[PDB]
Design a protein around this nucleic acid. Sequence first.
DNA 1: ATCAATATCCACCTGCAGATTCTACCAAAAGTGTATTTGGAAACTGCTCCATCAAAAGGCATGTTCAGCGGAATTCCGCTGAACATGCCTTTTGATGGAGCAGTTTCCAAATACACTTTTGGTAGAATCTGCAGGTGGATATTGAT
DNA 2: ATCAATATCCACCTGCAGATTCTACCAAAAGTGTATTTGGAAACTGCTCCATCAAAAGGCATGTTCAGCGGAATTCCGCTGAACATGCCTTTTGATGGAGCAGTTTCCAAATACACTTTTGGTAGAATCTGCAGGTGGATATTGAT
Lengths: 99, 55, 219, 108, 98, 84, 78, 97, 97, 279, 93, 96
Amino acid sequence: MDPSLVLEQTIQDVSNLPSEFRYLLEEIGSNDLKLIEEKKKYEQKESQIHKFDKEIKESLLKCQSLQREKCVLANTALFLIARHLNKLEKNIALLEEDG
Amino acid sequence: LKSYEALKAELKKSLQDRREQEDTFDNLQQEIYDKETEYFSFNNNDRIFSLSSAT
Amino acid sequence: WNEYDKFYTGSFQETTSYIKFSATVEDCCGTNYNMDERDETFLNEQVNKGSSDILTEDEFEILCSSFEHAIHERQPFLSMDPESILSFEELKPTLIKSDMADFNLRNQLNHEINSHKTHFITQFDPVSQMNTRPLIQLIEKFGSKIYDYWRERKIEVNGYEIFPQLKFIDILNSQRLRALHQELKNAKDLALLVAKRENVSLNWINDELKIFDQRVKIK
Amino acid sequence: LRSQSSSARAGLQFPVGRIKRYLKRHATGRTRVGSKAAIYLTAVLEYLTAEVLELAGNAAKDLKVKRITPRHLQLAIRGDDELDSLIRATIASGGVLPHINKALLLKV
Amino acid sequence: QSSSARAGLQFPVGRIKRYLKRHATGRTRVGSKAAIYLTAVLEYLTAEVLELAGNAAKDLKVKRITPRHLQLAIRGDDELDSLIRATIASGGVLPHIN
Amino acid sequence: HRKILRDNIQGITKPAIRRLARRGGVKRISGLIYEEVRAVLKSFLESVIRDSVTYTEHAKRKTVTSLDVVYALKRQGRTLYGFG
Amino acid sequence: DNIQGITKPAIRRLARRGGVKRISGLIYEEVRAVLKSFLESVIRDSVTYTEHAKRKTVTSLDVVYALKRQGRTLYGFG
Amino acid sequence: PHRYKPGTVALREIRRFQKSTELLIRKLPFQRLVREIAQDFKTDLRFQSSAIGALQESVEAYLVSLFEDTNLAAIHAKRVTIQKKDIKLARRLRGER
Amino acid sequence: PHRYKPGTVALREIRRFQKSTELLIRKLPFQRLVREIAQDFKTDLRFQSSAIGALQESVEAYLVSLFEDTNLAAIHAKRVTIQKKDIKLARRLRGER
Amino acid sequence: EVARVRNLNRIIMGKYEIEPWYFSPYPIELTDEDFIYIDDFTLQYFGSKKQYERYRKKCTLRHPPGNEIYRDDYVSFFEIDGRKQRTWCRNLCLLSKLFLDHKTLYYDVDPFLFYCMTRRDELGHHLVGYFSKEKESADGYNVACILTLPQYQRMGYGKLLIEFSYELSKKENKVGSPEKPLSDLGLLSYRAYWSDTLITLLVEHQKEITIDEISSMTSMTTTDILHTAKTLNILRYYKGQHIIFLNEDILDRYNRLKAKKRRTIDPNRLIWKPPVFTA
Amino acid sequence: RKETYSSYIYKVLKQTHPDTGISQKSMSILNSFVNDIFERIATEASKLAAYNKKSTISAREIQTAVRLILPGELAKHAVSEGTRAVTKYSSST
Amino acid sequence: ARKETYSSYIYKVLKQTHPDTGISQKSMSILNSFVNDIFERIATEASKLAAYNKKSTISAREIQTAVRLILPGELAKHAVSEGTRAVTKYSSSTQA
DNA sequence: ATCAATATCCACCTGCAGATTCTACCAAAAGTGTATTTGGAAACTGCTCCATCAAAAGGCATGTTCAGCGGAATTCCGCTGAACATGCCTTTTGATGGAGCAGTTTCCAAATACACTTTTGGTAGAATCTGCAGGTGGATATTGAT
DNA sequence: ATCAATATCCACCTGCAGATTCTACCAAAAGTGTATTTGGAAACTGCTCCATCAAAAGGCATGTTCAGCGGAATTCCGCTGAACATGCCTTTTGATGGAGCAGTTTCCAAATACACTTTTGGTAGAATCTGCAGGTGGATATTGAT
């Protein structure tokens, strides 16, 4: 009864994990907002050179501000999958004690 | 004037760096696709599923 | 009122769908403990007048951490130890085999991500990352007279916690073994794939920003 | 003060003695306590003081100053707690409650 | 000489004497002629055990079963409504197709 | 004397049973229910008057009264008030 | 302790004891409701009887007395 | 010259009859019927008038309950007319044989 | 093998179940259900198993009489399939409350 | 009778001082001092007052930990379960029993579900209320213990609280029911909603309505609808049917709908209702 | 000591056709019959005694109780054998 | 030349419960029949359960469970509350 | 119209459960012999009260036409019995704990039975002032042809 | 909608049985004080019986598609109750007789009550044997696509 009944708690723990992955659907849906804006932020940089200083030096504030919002979805996507993954093998280590 | 010669090495380092980052840009297509082909194992209910968000 | 002097520093985000965050509060804010002002008025006012180390506040986070990691789950049978401190050879595999609540899991995935420019940079860790230096590195050089932090500490709490505390069969059954284990194996390939795009995201940022500013002396 | 010991000591308005001797009459067994018959008094009273108080609520809504036998059954049958204490009972000249079901008049 | 066999019945007057008495209300029973109901339980118990032999050779059974009891204790339309609320335990019903 | 009478179950008339149905609430009456509702009326009358005449048979009363027939009509599970 | 009001598809055995044809859907909820009603009536009567006896175990005499009042003789069992 | 719709005077006599509570069947014919159903039981039985009135309103009660039964039966049988089989089911299900 | 018409095997198990006098319902969930109806009126009172068998004899007698009457109601409805309004008319014409 | 005295002098959480109301066997290290701080988005109580210079820097989570069901233009609703999340189920009770009359740490906090009442605030979703949920149909009691924080009481939240809990009775498709045994200052507001849902859903049908179908869309227990007869014309026909019909009333509740019937809940949200045989 | 009519009804079956047999549930159903119909006619007879402002539980009131308590032809055969056997009891002085 | 009835007592019930309401003699007989047969019903059920308890004396608890067992719900609970009230109030043997 | 694999009815066997038949203890109501005791079957009368009867309007029987509805039948679709493979709670079987039975002994509350003597509640009438009940007219709502 | 014709509510009315008080009275219970004999209450004591509890072989409940027949919507068409006239049957009402019912009193028969046997009638034992449930196996319907 020891290497069997704990598998039911594995079910309920990763139960909200696809809904957690459904929260990533907003997060990967958030890449529609800014990576297309990444295509559209380019139009005020190369078109303003024009066969060669407030638009060349201070233009980094339009670039440095955008890298903050991409990171919250990035690394947090990993560790949730890790606790979707890695905690099973400690229970498998209980299952490895028998067949 | 050897000043901009060694200063060009601060920007020639990026162009050898340019090839390895564009390769990672060039490697994007199959790793999106071959995961999605692996994901087919059914009718692809959406169109922009995980990494077709990028263009 | 003075209760809202410096509220908290932070900006939130809005939603477009339903927020779905099923996590653990014991793993949300990370570390468990904290200390008060009466512990550094001896060190930073009477001891550090001629010392060589430069004392920082971020080191207080992970400071006691390796000492309560052995006292609870590595040996639980103590209850009322008067001198409640296990000795130096009982604290030598603590810092070497540093199990800071599974420190390996929080870093072993990023190796095959190959994002070794930074480490562990996530939003759920707070935004003060520049002062982060692990005391698995910072004991043998600067934390030598800080290594004895926990040994004094349980004496004035009488061997107890500094915070308060609340009042205290195989056949026809083996088919869901591989039906449950293999399904969550495939999630690593999801994470490893979406890591590589968020790697090359930031690698696309540092392309031109150090190029064109140099052009004022070469063209 | 007052010392009228006519067994209104219970504060009950029915005779303790008449239903005492009627219990002593009905009496399939052998004995019957008058002191444990005082509870049997108000069982009868609550049967009545909640029946007929509920009755004369029709006298307001139908503007009668007496209460007569169709006024009994017309409102002694609406209270479903006091319904099934009369299911064996048939009130003489009591009439029927007005009851036309909706599918009878379908505007055909 | 006898006890109640001088009435010619089988059941006893003495058990049915007090069972009239302690069930009573009117305080006095006719002890020499309370045996008239002693007669009636015989007709009661014979008639719904004589019909147990109403189907002897057409059931092929020796003991009296409780489905053997009920499944012909309904054909007696006279004794049907004499048991109009009786629920024979594990007696089944009678076969019918409408 | 004897003073015999021919049975007159047709004494209850067609609009009488019509009015008795319209007390109940039926809006459309058949053409052939008449004789059979007469039949169930006669069955109810005989089922109650057997018990009434056996109560007046034990009462040593060669009349009938109201109290014995309300007793007899009580013991058919359909107890009547108002008349005792 | 929990809810076990789900009985069985022996409603399609008890109906089979009746002379019924093909039964329907959407009757099983009503038949378990009316079973709940009949049992709660008779168990209320039985618990009043066994409360008056001040015995904390019920007996078959209690249920035959309760049914014999309630309108049907639980007949030939006590 | 003037004529109502068919079926609308029916509800008028519904409300006129059930709003009031007088005895419905005529008194002396039912007295004759009680004596004629009596005469085969015991010859020349004397009657009490209040007993005959008790029978009047008792059989009025039972028959109006039976008409309520057949109204239920006919409104279940997707009809608006009552029939013989409605009374047959009413007698069969109310319980007496 | 061959498969006979639907309905016929149903009628032969009508016959097979109606001849038998076995207690048709399963006993131990009925024990469960009488505990369930017990604890909401009173705390833990005890049940003789013969008395639980007595309930397990009485309640399906009430159920099979209900099924007989609703069968006759549906065969009055000129159909061979009972419904919810069938059991509503059976209870209401029974005089259930 | 034990908690008829006071335990802390005053307790704050965020912006508003809360002079408490009920005793509880807390550690005595809380009761030696005056200022007791409570961390806002997570409620994990603080025996010391000298950590907001670093704990607000250590404050990692800003949205409160439940799962989003529906947010209107003003307020949202969240979802916390005990077996999958124990720690925030702990500190929910330590602020509840300060206000309540029923709690006891007797069983474990696992089986009964927690919902939340937190408003759209510009400094992150501050919580203003929370109401309990039993798992499944134990003694009826389909809605459960309800708290409302006096930092934001008497400003028109509690009616929006109780109807949203009542709003989840319909997708449950079951009999909605409160915990009966006690309520005094809430019970008249509890009885207000059954009167509020009385005439508003009544006139929208414009005809009569049958007694089971009252229990269809109102989804409350029939003892309440039977006890709603004392306010209105629920009159009882031939053998019990209890069915109702509209009478012309004052309808001033239905007429003056300006400010007291301020907002309601749009039925646009999702539910799980997890079936698990563990209890 | 419990009182049961089982031996007596066994002797009733003995004085009719002896080839047949009571089982352990058949005498329960038969004892329930005799006790139930006894209870019914006894309460009817006592109630009729009270109704007729009369004291003794007469044989005449058992006569009228069995006449009113049974359906027809069963009642007339029962009352025939009843009056027969009670005049037989009065015969042997 | 003798009769017993409950006439003036139910008339006093009407005087207490309503300030003015008349009763016809037909309605007096209606209510007298109701009180008499509900009297008989609870009396015979109480005596029946007194025999079924194998006791001999009829007392307040068996008629209490008779009240609780002969009625449906809410009038039964109000009736047994009124019964307990009345038996406790009679129990006080005092001057006033 | 026919040959079929399924199912039922019949017949012999065989374990085995329990119904039958004494049977003895045993003890217990039933029978019996008076003795006293009161309710009751029977006889006589005063008197309601219930038959039993002859003279006037209100309802009942019997028509009419007429359109509203009960049934026939089509038609179509969808719920619902029908095998069929498969999980799953069962069904005894045995055992442990233990506790609410049923019974003894007991002791004191208390209901019965008096008789005294009380106010006191039906009640026959008896007056006596009436609420209500059918009728009469007037304001206004509820079906029916255009 | 817009009137026509009833119908319903809404007073207003005067007379009529009928509720209402109510005094008298007189049976006629209720209440009161006192032994007193007994039956409920209670504490206690064997114990039989009932409650969990786990494990092992298997019926059987559960979801499955799936094909079909039974429910149901809508059509149309004869017929039968329905609305109303009217001619006519008999119901509703005040006086006259006889017997049945209510009541009084009488022996007097039959039933309580005591007290003393004793067949009889439960019960635990206990054989026993025999009828019955189940099993196996053979004879005779059983109702379908072609």
